[model samples]
Target: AMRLVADSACDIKELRGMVFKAVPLTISTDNEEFCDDGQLDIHRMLDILEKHKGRSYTACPGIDAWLEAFGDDDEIFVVTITAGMSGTYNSAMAARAVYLEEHPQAKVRVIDSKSTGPQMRIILEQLQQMIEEGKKFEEIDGAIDAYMQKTRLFCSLKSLHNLAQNGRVSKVVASAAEVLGISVIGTASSHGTLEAIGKCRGDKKLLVKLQALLDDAGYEGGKLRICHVENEALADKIADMIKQAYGTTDVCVYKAGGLCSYYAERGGIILSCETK
Candidate 1:
């Protein structure tokens, strides 16, 4: 009776106990376009991007793609990455309006996650919990919005080449960090844009910075999801650090999907957690 739909940026490969679908985005380089679907080869894409020097970009799913995911479910909930960074949210919103017009009796709600990767995954998991508890659609909708306010996203980027190329960060700054072996530490701001908070040169210092950020956000043994772009070693280390420091093992590690991989690049980490 109900279904969940999310964009590929959520980094969720599968969902159990419910009908779920992910509308993929398209990653484009000078020579090729890779669809962010289940069949995509993330490693290959990363390899290609690593060697390619021309312009690259991404395209959000079209209205038809969203409609296909919506299907004929009586109740549908859609989640997308931040509108601050991409047009996925707006495209989903437009699709929702069109779907409602055609199926007047159906209930459809599109949520702009205001963040991506682990943060979006957090929202999806909470929604699944609410649904499993038999909460009504409207009630779940309101509660999820409130829940989002308490969640935050932080990132550690070892390679800022993609970000700099896309103009999301200064080219000079990216190059400087690379030369110095410095990683950028940032958070998704309340308004949904990325904001750099700190920087460090090695994994040791990086862990320290991340721990301080968790404390600053009032994180206390809550649920945490760490998504990595070909950096499971760092992700696992972060998980171990959190478990020891916070005394909670509610941490999950996931491989970043295509869209996330595109932005985070290789050897980057995205962490999402609930805070007071």
Candidate 2:
């Protein structure tokens, strides 16, 4: 039954293709299942957070959990959601160090992808493209460099309070910024932190500003995906604007939920579109 041990996906993403399984997301507020068993539901976790706001949460796969995960699979490739947003990356590294001792032949490499949502998907897509081209691990890695250089995640928020509570912004500033009506732009850095890169009002103006940043980044040869919390309609409107400018019909839409947990802030939108 288990013939080649790997079978069947015309275009399975690299993370998927690795036959390597992921340790699901877990935290103080929620837990990411380490089992290959499909038990944990991330969407549900986000929903839990949506109902609970202004409370701190720490998400990381337990060291023992990762160790157990590696027990079955000798070769492992671990990719965390975003090192900036979660502690899983550090946990994975710690587990790998211990895992290598028991099974020296067991190869495990972890990548700290500095992105989240569809932006994380973009990284997966690029990895898939490379594997499809019969590119080696080293060659495909070069693509990561290019992806980092060209990739940018931009966003907007209705309330500034969420950022402060999430520790992305200062609590003191959150009060003043909300009072000031700070319509800010959120962007992901190569460091994995979703810092405020810029700000504007109305989806229309925000779209224009995002395009400007893409132009400056010289974005090319990639896809666009937007993530929003409680504002899918506005996100769609913005994605349409980008498609018009890029002259392409492809666009991806994802719901941003965890952000809602930080403050019950509804209008949280993110654009993970290519520049070119």
Candidate 3:
């Protein structure tokens, strides 16, 4: 059987007990560290993160960990975060190198998603469909590259404290967000960076703006995934919006793991849709 391994960022919880294993990443704050195990208590982590005045960061699994995940003699399919954003893609490729040196016959294919979170989730689901259809590895690889180009990622931040702490946004911007209670919205650029779109106040306004952005971008809406960090109610709200707009109920909602949680910060939501 072919083995499929994804970084914890993809949020592949439902595929458990099958041929899927999620190599977890680590989240570290000034006072605490949490692993992206399947059983992560998001609320508790958010509590700690909220108290941390210092910058919190995420660490991808080490090369050795990837090697062990790839060590077994089986065909391996690996999906990683955007190469432009994180070192996980390079780490996985390096591990593949080490594994292939000893087991040159190992068939290992690593896909640089050029995205993460629900975006990767969409791709993994597509991979499942292709595998079920018995498509060859080469065929699936070719198709996924095109799919990656069409994936759309939008992230909204309800708190700017984390970005200010990490020097991502200016202190003035963070202060305005806190004082004005505004939400910052951004889109993942094709180059894999988050480019600020605009900011709005109130949750309802933010959600409406998101829908408008999708419409203006001409979103075709293939499969949709909503990921949140301690914000399930909002995720459900957006899922409903997607279902209403797309005329489909194929939306999936999941809690964000280490990678997304770190970038998105607390009370952040990421929406990813595969465009046809």
Candidate 4:
């Protein structure tokens, strides 16, 4: 049996107790540091981000963590956050390289999920089924890149605090957006980078824009999930909207943790969809 392992960016809590293991990504601020081992309170993390503003950053799990998790197994499947977005994928790859250098007999397939959050969740869940069906690791790996081609991630931020803090956006722009009550809308680009496609005021109108984006992309409903940083109420509301418009009942809501929350910041809502 192939061991299934993923980084903490995949937000499904159930994986923690299952045979699957999620290596935590870290979030650090001037005041405190926390790991997303499914233990730290997401609410508290959000609170810290809001309080500290630009004084925050994230670090991915190192080679040691991945080496330890890889173990002495002959076959293993690993998933990580997008390559450019975080070093999590790169770290996993580095670990794979080092382990193979020492023990060339082990087989480890590290997947650069290319997307994070709910999208990663969907991919891993499907891979789990393939494993149960006794499919070969190569067979599953062959299909992953194709699956990523049909996946999309949409996010609406309440403020540009995280972006400005992380240097993705200027302080002036962030301040102006906050003052004007304009929300920035981001969609996953070709290589897992986020591209800000449009902007609008008010959360209600933001949903309409996102729905239009999803429709234009031909997301007629495959698997979908909502990831939020201290915003379950809003996540549920958007999930309902997606269900109503797309006629998909597989929409799920999950709380963002650690690295995800740091990237999403406070009052952020993310929708990840797999196209049919």
lDDT of each: 0.90, 0.58, 0.78, 0.79
Per-residue lDDT, model 1, residue 168, is 74
Please tell me which predicted candidate would have the highest TM-score against the true structure. Answer: 1
Tens-place lDDT per residue, model 2, 1-276, is 000010000011224444433444433443332222245343565565557554644455578877866665654445555667667678878888888887866656566667655665566666666656777565655566576567677767766654566576655535534644456776677678757666575667877887787777766535777767667798888777777776646677765433232332466676676654
Question: Better model by lDDT, 1 or 3?
Answer: 1
Ranking by lDDT: 1, 4, 3, 2
- TM-score for all predictions? 0.97, 0.73, 0.90, 0.91
**After best superposition, candidate 1 residue 168: deviation in angstroms?**
2.2
Candidate 1 at 48: error in angstroms? Answer: 0.8
Worst 10 residues of 4 by lDDT: 12-21
**lDDT (tens digit, per residue) of candidate 1 on 1-276:** 679999999998678887789899999987799999988999999999888879899899999999999998879999999988888999999999999988978998899999999999999989998999999999998999999999999998987887777777777557645855788888998878878887788888988998988998999989999999999999999999999999877889989999999999888999999998
In terms of lDDT, the poorest run of 10 residues in model 2 is 1-10
Clashing pairs in 1: none
lDDT of 3 at 32: 75
User: Using alpha carbons, what is the TM-score of model 1?
Assistant: 0.97
- Ordered by TM-score, highest first, the candidates read 1, 4, 3, 2
